[PDB]
């Protein structure tokens, strides 16, 4: 599942609270790479570090892992292509 992929890259066990759909143009700016189709930003919060772990995948039902984005208490992302 998606929760494991989060634990696979970060080692932290988190529950996905929301999955926000985003069009190619929207995630192109932030990520700095335009995706081939609509992306789902799977977001989980980790109060332990006040970080936001976002697992971006393609739309349903494939959910093909695209990238992993971590945002800290300063709203700064640490992007990692998958």
């Amino acid at each position: 599942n998606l929760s494991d992929i989060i634990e696979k890259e970060t080692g932290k066990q988190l529950v996905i609270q929301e999955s926000i759909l985003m069009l190619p143009e929207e995630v192109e700016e932030v990520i700095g790479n335009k995706p081939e189709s609509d992306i789902l930003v799977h977001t989980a919060y980790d109060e332990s570090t006040d970080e936001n772990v976002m697992l971006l995948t393609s739309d349903a039902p494939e959910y093909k892992p695209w990238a992993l984005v971590i945002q800290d208490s300063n709203g700064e992302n640490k992007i990692k292509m998958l």
Partner: protein, 223 residues
């Protein structure tokens, strides 16, 4: 002007019956779907047509146990505030005088004040995000926005993210007040949502029109 009055003809549509029937069939087949069938139309329940003052669009209901309850962005009491709602809070604190971050995400009080918290897709299969899209809900919610654009006047629309913004095409921008901005998702809040001032701009538009402004501080019902 009620929902049963303007949506009556739409309830008859083949595509609409097809959707409810697909959802219902899946529930019957052991496929857990959120929110419970009793909560799928809560947004219309809480906010009648003549009462709509603000329209905030969401996408689909939360896919986790006990989160969704018929309102967009809102989660039931005892549920952790989702990241997006949290960012909605951070923007409200920064702009609305007297607003202090709440400890929950239950927004029934918004709906009670004329804020139609509408998701464009009213259901989802538990555990799988966006599993009920391109299944009919979009057509329905398209008509709902079309009906608001038509029978009403001066309603302020808050469209977040490009997906939601596409639904502004059926809204006359001189007839209604449309405010665009990026999604409050952590990924996109920093490119236009923070500082958008949508909440205060919404109330100013409501006061310059005789209507009573929204008290954005959500409240929790007893016990």
């Amino acid at each position: 002007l009620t929902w049963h009055d303007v949506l009556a003809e739409e309830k008859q549509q083949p595509y609409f019956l097809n959707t409810l029937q697909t959802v219902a069939s899946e529930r019957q087949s052991g496929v857990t779907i959120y929110p419970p069938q009793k909560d799928v139309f809560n947004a219309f329940r809480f906010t009648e047509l003549g009462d709509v003052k603000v329209v905030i669009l969401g996408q689909d209901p939360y896919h986790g146990p006990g989160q969704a309850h018929g309102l967009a962005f809102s989660v039931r009491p005892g549920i952790a505030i989702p990241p997006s709602l949290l960012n909605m809070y951070k923007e409200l604190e920064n702009t609305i005088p007297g607003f202090t971050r709440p400890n929950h995400g239950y927004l029934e009080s918004w709906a009670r004040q004329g804020v139609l918290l509408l998701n464009t897709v009213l259901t989802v299969r538990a555990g799988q995000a966006h599993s009920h899209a391109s299944l009919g809900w979009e057509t329905f919610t398209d008509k709902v926005i079309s009906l608001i654009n038509q029978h009403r006047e001066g309603v302020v629309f808050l469209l977040w993210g490009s997906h939601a913004q596409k639904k502004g095409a059926i809204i006359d921008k001189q007839r209604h007040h449309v405010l665009k901005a990026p999604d409050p998702s952590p990924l996109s809040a920093h490119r236009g949502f923070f500082g958008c001032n949508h909440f205060v701009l919404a109330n100013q538009w409501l006061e310059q029109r005789g209507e009573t402004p929204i008290d954005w501080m959500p409240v929790l019902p007893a016990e």
